[PDB]
Amino acid sequence: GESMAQRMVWVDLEMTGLDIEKDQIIEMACLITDSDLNILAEGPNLIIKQPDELLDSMSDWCKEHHGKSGLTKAVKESTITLQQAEYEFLSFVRQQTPPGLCPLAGNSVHEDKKFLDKYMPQFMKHLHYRIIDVSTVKELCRRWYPEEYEFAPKKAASHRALDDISESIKELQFYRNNIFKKKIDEKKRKIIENG
Ligand code: NA
């Protein structure tokens, strides 16, 4: 019960840009973790068809980054509509999390949430309204733990959805292991009794 409710729905998107009024989702990946960040299930990892005219009018940043990663070409070749993609993700979370209870998780995942609330509303209805924003923890680490912040893992930052999810989980695990309070565990308790 409570273990299921404490799962996390990790999502990362690529979009044609940051303009919620015009830009569209072009890539989406999703992983489920337990409350302790262990990966329980890998969800769909999908490249979503969007029109040539939209791709051709992307900002230079998006043209350069989605171009060199291969994403732009893959979007043009995709046969997956937004609606079919949403169904794959919704079916996946229905198999993995109790309705309404689990949050989106990722770096600045409120941006993904803005796009998903608009373009995948039925997927979002399965989730809690709260988020696990790894970048909130990043911003607190930089302020409160500046020495530890220097040791956070370097990111490849490939702007491909599934790879970036994995780096987000690793960043949050780094914070848990380095800036949160230490606790007892099964191994430490046995040592205390032996001593
Ligand atoms: Na992102």
Side-chain angles (χ1 to χ4, degrees), residues 12-13 107 112:
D12 186 56
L13 306 185
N107 280 98
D112 309 73

Side-chain angles (χ1 to χ4, degrees), residues 3 6 23 39 47 72 74 77 96 107 109 116 119 125 130 133 140 143 147 152 163 166 173 183 189:
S3 66
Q6 292 186 15
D23 285 309
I39 296 167
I47 295 164
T72 298
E77 296 170 342
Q96 298 290 334
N107 280 98
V109 73
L116 294 164
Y119 290 115
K125 195 187 84 173
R130 290 178 182 150
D133 189 340
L140 297 179
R143 288 168 168 77
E147 293 183 20
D163 289 340
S166 306
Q173 190 65 61
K183 308 183 88 204
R189 171 166 60 196

